[PDB]
Amino acid sequence: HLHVIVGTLIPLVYEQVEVQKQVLDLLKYLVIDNKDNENLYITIKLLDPFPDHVVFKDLRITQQKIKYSRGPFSLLEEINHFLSVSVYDALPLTRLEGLKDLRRQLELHKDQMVDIMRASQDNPQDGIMVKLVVNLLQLSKMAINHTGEKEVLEAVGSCLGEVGPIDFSTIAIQHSKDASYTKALKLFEDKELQWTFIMLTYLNNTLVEDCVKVRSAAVTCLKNILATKTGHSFWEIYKMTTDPMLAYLQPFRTSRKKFLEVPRFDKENPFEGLDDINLWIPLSENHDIWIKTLTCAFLDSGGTKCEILQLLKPMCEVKTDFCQTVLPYLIHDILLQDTNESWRNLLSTHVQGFFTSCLRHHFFRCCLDKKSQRTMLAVVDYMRRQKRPSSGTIFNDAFWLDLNYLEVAKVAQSCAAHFTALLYAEIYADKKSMDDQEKISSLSEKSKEETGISLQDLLLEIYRSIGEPDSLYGCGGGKMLQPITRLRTYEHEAMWGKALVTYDLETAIPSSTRQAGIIQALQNLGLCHILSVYLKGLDYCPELEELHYQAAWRNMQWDHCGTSYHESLYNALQSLRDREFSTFYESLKYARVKEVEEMCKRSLESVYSLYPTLSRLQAIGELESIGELFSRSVTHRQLSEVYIKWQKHSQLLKDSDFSFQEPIMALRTVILEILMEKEMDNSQRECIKDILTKHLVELSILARTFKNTQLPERAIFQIKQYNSVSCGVSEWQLEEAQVFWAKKEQSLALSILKQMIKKLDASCAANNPSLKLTYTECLRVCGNWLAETCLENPAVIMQTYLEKAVEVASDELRNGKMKAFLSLARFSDTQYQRIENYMKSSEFENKQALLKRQRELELDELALRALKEDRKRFLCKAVENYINCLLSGEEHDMWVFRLCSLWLENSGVSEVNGMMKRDGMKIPTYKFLPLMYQLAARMGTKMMGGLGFHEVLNNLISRISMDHPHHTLFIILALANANRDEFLTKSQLDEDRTEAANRIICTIRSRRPQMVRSVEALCDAYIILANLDATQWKTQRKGINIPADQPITKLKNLEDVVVPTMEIKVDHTGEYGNLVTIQSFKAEFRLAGGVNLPKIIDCVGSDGKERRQLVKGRDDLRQDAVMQQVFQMCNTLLQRNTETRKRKLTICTYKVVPLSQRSGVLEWCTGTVPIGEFLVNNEDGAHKRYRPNDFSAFQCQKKMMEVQKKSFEEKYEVFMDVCQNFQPVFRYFCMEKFLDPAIWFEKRLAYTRSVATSSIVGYILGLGDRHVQNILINEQSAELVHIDLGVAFEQGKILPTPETVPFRLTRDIVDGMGITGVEGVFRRCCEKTMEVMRNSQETLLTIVEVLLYDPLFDWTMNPLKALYLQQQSFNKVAERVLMRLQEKLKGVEEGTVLSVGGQVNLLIQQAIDPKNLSRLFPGWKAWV
């Protein structure tokens, strides 16, 4: 109670001295002299900081000393402390000092804010920043209509201005929930006991309330409840726990011989009380009396089995909130004991009547208050989560009462509960389909016919309210022709010209909306003068004045004169120009308060509703920040510091939408222009001009990154207006060239860049340190552009631009050197590839064969020698520049694949080996880790010498292993232990590889003997465990004790060995001090099923946590390892791109550690169940629990196996018949696993994105064998994990009964996506992933070329593997596969080049085609 007392006493200090002395000495006794007490030390530490005043100086000093013990606080620790204090809040006004301190901490450190955002990337839902934002919003909500409303609102707006519109990667707002409450609820296993606990907790909380009338009712109810047998059982269960409610309720609990018994009274007709229509449907007002009367009627008349409910009448009579809380429990209790469904029918009829009355529009009964609607929605939501007496399924449990869920969904949408509205719409659609089967556009028109509500329109409205961008595409197609929908689509896609044309053309649209859209489109197109003249013409609604003020402050007119937002901003800027600082600060404070109040008045359902308010608050905060700079004398250091702060906080907004970043940049530009105008000092004016030029260049770059062209041109024009140029060399001219190039005006950009190059060459010989970077960048960009447009021959481009750029060229200089080296290497590689393609082409061989049938031969020999010399020169240049590029940076690290491919192919070339030995060894070792498998498989002992390939490769492998033993030791040892399986139980290339691996192992052991010995022992134990026969316990499923003779049990405390199946973060330094190490193995091991019966074991590490590992014998895991490497590279590519990073598109991966030719170990995914196990299980499959009257999976499999020998027509007919009697059921996974609508929506969206990404990535890699048992779904995250990666690169199409689908997109997979199916989120995510794949075709091609040519990678289909799957020619096969992959990446399908959307449309229609699905193998289970 200390915090409550302190918060109450703090305001009383200012009242008067007479009470000030008493309050001060009481507080001093509370905190000052009590610091010795250990019990209250934590309570004092977790307390609100005292207000900063002279009176509180000693208290503040003591509080700071106590809190900041054991070290200082970081930003994350400060926010955690703020939230922990916020756990208990008596009043919002007591949090003002904490809010100010939090704002100061946030504004002081933003690099720590970047670190926090990076750390929270893995689990965005548990992000600290979004939690802080929602906590602040809730605090501001609680401050409405109180004494300190404006003070709290201003502080909340001040702190929210610091964070700004950061992309939180969340869509659903998760309100804070008590952890102890959930655990206490979990403790009780009986329904009646939980009601008792909840009611007693509510009464205990009510006891503290001020009203004396409610206290008597609360104590009476407590005494009545605790006397009964249910109360005694509750106390017996709950006395073991630790909670102050136990101590508070001790006096009321009494011991009596007989438990208090409630006299059960039964009327002649219990249904007469609740049969009144007026009772259920209230008026517009009088909600409290309505809910009280309904609760009394339920309690007095309806017979309730539970004794606790009957004792709640005195508490229900006084408090309305108690009635609202208890009504669902009363309804559930009455429905539990219902017989003959009389109560069910009556309640269903009355509730449906209430919901229909809510949907009118006055009428006789309509326009009900939102409180009653929310109460009924809470009743429905509570009933949805309760298991029905007849058991059944969650879908069955939804219909406790016969309800038309479309009306309920519409009411929920009207109440701003969008996620539950979508869930109820889905439930209604499913119920309508189920009912129709007994006897969207069709469903929409039917629902409009009977219920008067269109399903498609409701779904569109709900998805618009949610704010998810991708979902809006798949809503429907009924109203696409309407101008309003087209205009909304144009605005969403930033097609401002189309939106402007449509707004001008359509006149049926209301004038206000039409003019607002016209003004917004004109502003977004950069037509500022046209917009101003148009507004002047309109002079012949508040929104019009709002747009007037926005245009006025954006155009700096300064003449166009409840206050709104842009009006406040314009007034603040005008007063800032007029040096009226008081009005400036007052207007900014008023704008803060108004924006925060408007934000907190909303229901706060989705995160996307917070971004505009955050952007506006950030703009206001920046204006207030520059206010003090304008107030005092302007210095260069202050301007540099404020620009650095702006750049950091813009870096915080990297992934934010352009619609939120743009107003901030516009305000910054106006700010800088005003500051330059009001300078009157040449020395500072130059610095202000430089700052404005840098800001405008950054704005141009930002607008170009979002495919915007008018804004960069306007920014360049402003730069020209201010930064008048006569020297003719500057970075903004390079930015102008880039802008012109972005507009597809290549001639102008090339002319500008060549003029800049000639001016730079004439001015100096690249001797100015400031202009060196600009010269190098101009040369490199011009060379790349000329190469792209083919306007110059390769010789001129190489000699004039790229080689010169390298020769011209301190972090910026290092980055420029890296970029120039990469460009030169890429051009040289292009020339080398062109010359090699010509040498390997059929035209060259035909020309050679023509002369095969005398000076012609001499000329041919001379030409061949010249071609070979040119090829070698290009190769050497490319390799050298790649090596130099890898040295000077880390951004282009994935080019190590191309470098290693070039080195490996030309092994015999001494120059390449020489430059790899001299400068290649200086490359950091961690950059070779992704290619460790190939580099280790390529090593041998044949070419031994000073510049021999094998010697250099062995040295590189040894250095990599020395620097990163944890990442490479297992691979090398597995190379050495290829044939140790037979030795443990009882070709020249292979033996050379074994010898090289043994040599590297000997070197590492000479460096680290103990680690090598322990790793060898662990590998031997794993191999011995794998070879153990497990057919004895094949039927066993409860776990089997490992035999004592197994060496694995003996191993203990291996502190030099890290858990092999645990992913390890790459460390540039070679310390690796703090890593989890293997401690012991649990005695029991389980079986996962399958032909070979793999064993699952548990490995407890240094900490208490343990990891499950899958030990596989008689199986090859190297293919899985390399496929996981490909998946990691694709994940890096996806995370690098902004569009795929925003959607969190990733490929789930699991670490695989091969041990021998046929032995290995891999990480076992926890919480993942196979989709086939969930769907078509014989015992408790989803197809059996739901739709039990349909065909069983056994019948479908039998029919499809029987129709195997018949023709294609018979197969198609049988497949259609099976699909008719086998409906999808997979949509219930998220419905039954996640009961909260927001969590359900998030998990379903994650599932859809995972399906899209996995499908696209698998198609790019030609992934096959994607049956039900090879796909797992995580129960916690609802994401799919693809396993058994043996078949890839379209080798499944060579099988008998070839696979004719790019990926698995069967009816269950699409059904899991929701009512929209493949439309909406899935299609757009597939398009984004395919676009990312297209943009990185060269990197993927290099990676796959390195992988395929790996000697140890067995990826070609063979007759033995073909027979097992369904119960040199290698060079040309690999070339054909690479060409097919290149065609896929470029988009060439069957000789026709397609766009990303067209290719995605083709893939989807090929995957979902029943014609292709019918011809597939019956084991693939296409019907599932």
Ligand SMILES: Nc1ncnc2c1ncn2[C@@H]1O[C@H](COP(=O)(O)OP(=O)(O)OP(O)(O)=S)[C@@H](O)[C@H]1O
């Ligand atoms: N990483 C993993 N996480 C979880 N379960 C896995 C994992 N890898 C394999 N399993 C399961 O282990 C069992 C057998 O795995 P597989 O590698 O597919 O064996 P198999 O040689 O393919 O024989 P099958 O599956 O009967 S054709 C299946 O039940 C898989 O779901």
Ligand SMILES: [Mg+2]
């Ligand atoms: Mg399998």
Ligand SMILES: [Zn+2]
């Ligand atoms: Zn009305």
